[PDB]
Design an enzyme around this catalytic site. Structure first.
Site, PDB file in Angstrom:
ATOM      1  N   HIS A 179       0.773  -1.270   0.000  1.00 51.08           N
ATOM      2  CA  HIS A 179       0.000   0.000   0.000  1.00 51.08           C
ATOM      3  C   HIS A 179       0.801   1.315   0.000  1.00 51.08           C
ATOM      4  CE1 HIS A 179       0.010  -0.683   4.468  1.00 51.08           C
ATOM      5  NE2 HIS A 179       0.229   0.623   4.461  1.00 51.08           N
ATOM      6  N   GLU A 199       0.582  -8.429   0.464  1.00 47.05           N
ATOM      7  CA  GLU A 199       0.710  -7.063   0.995  1.00 47.05           C
ATOM      8  C   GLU A 199       2.186  -6.639   1.186  1.00 47.05           C
ATOM      9  OE1 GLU A 199      -1.670  -5.150   0.718  1.00 47.05           O
ATOM     10  OE2 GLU A 199      -0.908  -3.391   1.783  1.00 47.05           O
ATOM     11  N   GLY A 239       1.315   5.599  10.284  1.00 47.64           N
ATOM     12  CA  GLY A 239       2.689   6.033  10.463  1.00 47.64           C
ATOM     13  C   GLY A 239       3.612   4.904  10.853  1.00 47.64           C
ATOM     14  N   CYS A 277       3.542   1.756   9.379  1.00 48.13           N
ATOM     15  CA  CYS A 277       3.625   0.723   8.345  1.00 48.13           C
ATOM     16  C   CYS A 277       5.031   0.609   7.830  1.00 48.13           C
ATOM     17  CB  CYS A 277       2.638   0.959   7.202  1.00 48.13           C
ATOM     18  SG  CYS A 277       0.972   0.560   7.677  1.00 48.13           S
TER      19      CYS A 277
HETATM   20  C1  LIG Z   1       0.093   2.116   7.846  1.00 45.65           C
HETATM   21  C2  LIG Z   1       0.009   3.513   7.198  1.00 45.65           C
HETATM   22  C3  LIG Z   1       1.199   4.446   7.423  1.00 45.65           C
HETATM   23  O1  LIG Z   1       2.341   4.109   7.801  1.00 45.65           O
HETATM   24  O2  LIG Z   1       0.987   5.853   7.134  1.00 45.65           O
HETATM   25  C4  LIG Z   1       1.836   6.525   6.195  1.00 45.65           C
HETATM   26  C5  LIG Z   1       2.063   7.939   6.677  1.00 45.65           C
HETATM   27  C6  LIG Z   1      -1.317   1.710   8.323  1.00 45.65           C
HETATM   28  C7  LIG Z   1      -1.291   1.121   9.728  1.00 45.65           C
HETATM   29  C8  LIG Z   1      -2.673   0.679  10.200  1.00 45.65           C
HETATM   30  C9  LIG Z   1      -3.799   1.711  10.081  1.00 45.65           C
HETATM   31  C10 LIG Z   1      -4.506   1.799  11.439  1.00 45.65           C
HETATM   32  N1  LIG Z   1      -3.584   1.027  12.258  1.00 45.65           N
HETATM   33  C11 LIG Z   1      -2.622   0.458  11.665  1.00 45.65           C
HETATM   34  O3  LIG Z   1      -1.653  -0.245  12.231  1.00 45.65           O
HETATM   35  N2  LIG Z   1      -1.890   0.662   7.451  1.00 45.65           N
HETATM   36  C12 LIG Z   1      -2.975   0.931   6.693  1.00 45.65           C
HETATM   37  O4  LIG Z   1      -3.507   2.037   6.691  1.00 45.65           O
HETATM   38  C13 LIG Z   1      -3.540  -0.160   5.805  1.00 45.65           C
HETATM   39  C14 LIG Z   1      -3.526   0.403   4.372  1.00 45.65           C
HETATM   40  C15 LIG Z   1      -4.028  -0.466   3.229  1.00 45.65           C
HETATM   41  C16 LIG Z   1      -4.533   0.187   2.093  1.00 45.65           C
HETATM   42  C17 LIG Z   1      -5.007  -0.548   1.006  1.00 45.65           C
HETATM   43  C18 LIG Z   1      -4.985  -1.941   1.054  1.00 45.65           C
HETATM   44  C19 LIG Z   1      -4.477  -2.599   2.177  1.00 45.65           C
HETATM   45  C20 LIG Z   1      -4.003  -1.867   3.267  1.00 45.65           C
HETATM   46  N3  LIG Z   1      -4.933  -0.499   6.104  1.00 45.65           N
HETATM   47  C21 LIG Z   1      -5.415  -0.955   7.281  1.00 45.65           C
HETATM   48  O5  LIG Z   1      -4.738  -1.137   8.293  1.00 45.65           O
HETATM   49  C22 LIG Z   1      -6.906  -1.242   7.295  1.00 45.65           C
HETATM   50  C23 LIG Z   1      -7.637   0.099   7.330  1.00 45.65           C
HETATM   51  C24 LIG Z   1      -9.037   0.105   7.951  1.00 45.65           C
HETATM   52  C25 LIG Z   1      -9.153   1.397   8.737  1.00 45.65           C
HETATM   53  O6  LIG Z   1      -9.299   1.375   9.959  1.00 45.65           O
HETATM   54  O7  LIG Z   1      -9.038   2.687   8.036  1.00 45.65           O
HETATM   55  C26 LIG Z   1     -10.056   3.354   7.271  1.00 45.65           C
HETATM   56  C27 LIG Z   1      -9.777   4.849   7.427  1.00 45.65           C
HETATM   57  C28 LIG Z   1      -9.927   3.009   5.784  1.00 45.65           C
HETATM   58  C29 LIG Z   1     -11.449   2.994   7.805  1.00 45.65           C
HETATM   59  N4  LIG Z   1      -7.370  -2.095   8.403  1.00 45.65           N
HETATM   60  C30 LIG Z   1      -8.193  -3.152   8.221  1.00 45.65           C
HETATM   61  O8  LIG Z   1      -8.630  -3.467   7.119  1.00 45.65           O
HETATM   62  O9  LIG Z   1      -8.624  -3.984   9.347  1.00 45.65           O
HETATM   63  C31 LIG Z   1      -9.982  -3.937   9.807  1.00 45.65           C
HETATM   64  C32 LIG Z   1     -10.659  -5.294   9.695  1.00 45.65           C
HETATM   65  C33 LIG Z   1     -10.130  -6.418  10.351  1.00 45.65           C
HETATM   66  C34 LIG Z   1     -10.775  -7.662  10.241  1.00 45.65           C
HETATM   67  C35 LIG Z   1     -11.941  -7.795   9.479  1.00 45.65           C
HETATM   68  C36 LIG Z   1     -12.471  -6.676   8.826  1.00 45.65           C
HETATM   69  C37 LIG Z   1     -11.834  -5.430   8.937  1.00 45.65           C
END
Ligand SMILES: *[C@@H](CC(=O)OCC)[C@H](C[C@@H]1CCNC1=O)NC(=O)[C@H](Cc1ccccc1)NC(=O)[C@H](CCC(=O)OC(C)(C)C)NC(=O)OCc1ccccc1
Ligand SMILES: *[C@@H](CC(=O)OCC)[C@H](C[C@@H]1CCNC1=O)NC(=O)[C@H](Cc1ccccc1)NC(=O)[C@H](CCC(=O)OC(C)(C)C)NC(=O)OCc1ccccc1
Lengths: 181, 181
Positions: A41, A72, A146, A148
């Site tokens: 991502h 991923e 932040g 990841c």
């Molecule tokens: C790292 C981003 C980073 O470093 O920022 C750059 C400045 C994120 C860390 C995550 C986010 C929240 N806590 C963390 O540890 N990672 C992400 O944002 C990833 C991104 C991504 C994008 C596209 C495809 C795959 C992954 N996404 C998630 O962690 C994801 C996001 C869901 C969420 O809470 O955010 C919104 C704003 C979109 C709603 N989490 C997820 O899917 O898990 C939920 C879930 C678990 C089990 C069953 C169903 C849902």
């Protein structure tokens, strides 16, 4: 816990960097030669910002299993003369489970921060960011944006890269030896 | 570095808490009995939020040296039946200098994060937040808002509490044994 922290600190010093893409800021782990890894991502382009420096991306593989299912992880080939210290020996052939791990971050946001995340359990299947995803390692820690690219380690072992969280648990993609030849 | 991390983790588990005041969120270190410490700028009132819980502040001393000069520490007496594990034995009689220290934070923002900050040098005088301040310990790490109250440690030693930074260096107020009797 002590030696796991000691191991983590030396790994981040030697092999890690802060990367910025159009998609945010990440921790990046260099693996061998000129090959490094980001969360898929991060969506790295032709050029990334690596420790504030314009680096050319020669090649980029988004990883999928045998079904074509997303893991991923993106592997990146970097245009630089420095080679990374080869850390393939620290990568398991299969998903590792551990009672104490440390998650290591190196961004502008979380500069050289180390987190004891506790037990890591193999969690294989997870619907991450809407997407079905395999080979997830789980830890009960409130991980945030932040973080990841964060590197999950135990003494002498690199387990995976932090790729997501649901606000209560965090998940790393397992960093398996066969991804790198 | 290993044992210093091991020491820090066990200290934060036993004696630390997340505190919110009208002035922000802080890491708080419990010292003995019902006495804890915050940076003076936390400016704790009659009641603080301690791990989300309304706790009554029975008494609060802002610390100053013999000249009446600010040390940038407030000691707080908490209205709770639990006593803290007495950690006075880990507090030096004078400012400690060390080659490897770990700074430990426990806020909503930086939950259980540990930072290897390197060399700690006695820095005594510093004009902090405009205010002349004595007994500062210095480390070359980019410390940020949200890290105040952070606990600076080395193996078997609690050195001070993080109270400020100038964006390039961070500074702890030395946590001296005589402040606590
Ligand atoms: C790292 C981003 C980073 O470093 O920022 C750059 C400045 C994120 C860390 C995550 C986010 C929240 N806590 C963390 O540890 N990672 C992400 O944002 C990833 C991104 C991504 C994008 C596209 C495809 C795959 C992954 N996404 C998630 O962690 C994801 C996001 C869901 C969420 O809470 O955010 C919104 C704003 C979109 C709603 N989490 C997820 O899917 O898990 C939920 C879930 C678990 C089990 C069953 C169903 C849902
Ligand atoms: C902790 C705050 C926190 O946890 O947030 C709660 C949610 C802060 C950590 C500091 C800030 C930046 N980096 C850090 O590590 N600490 C402070 O904000 C303290 C607060 C304070 C207030 C009143 C009296 C004393 C202390 N202040 C400083 O660190 C101070 C602030 C200067 C600054 O950059 O902020 C602005 C916005 C006011 C401009 N730093 C300081 O004085 O050092 C600069 C300096 C060094 C040497 C000579 C002259 C100046």
């Amino acid at each position: 816990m002590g030696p796991a922290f000691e191991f983590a600190v030396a790994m981040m010093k030697r092999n890690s960097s802060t990367v910025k893409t159009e998609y945010g800021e990440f921790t990046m782990l260099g693996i061998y030669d000129r090959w490094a890894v980001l969360p898929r991502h991060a969506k790295p382009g032709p050029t990334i910002l690596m420790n504030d420096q314009e680096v050319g991306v020669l090649d980029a593989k988004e990883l999928v299993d045998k079904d074509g299912t997303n893991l991923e992880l993106t592997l990146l080939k970097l245009n630089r003369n420095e080679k990374f210290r080869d850390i393939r020996g620290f990568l398991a052939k299969e998903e590792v489970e551990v009672n104490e791990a440390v998650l290591a971050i190196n961004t502008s946001k979380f500069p050289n921060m180390y987190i004891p995340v506790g037990q890591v359990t193999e969690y294989g299947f997870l619907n991450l960011g809407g997407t079905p995803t395999k080979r997830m390692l789980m830890y009960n820690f409130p991980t945030r944006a932040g973080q990841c690219g964060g590197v999950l380690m135990s003494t002498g072992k690199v387990l995976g890269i932090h790729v997501g969280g649901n606000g209560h648990q965090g998940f790393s993609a397992a960093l398996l030896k066969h991804y790198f030849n």
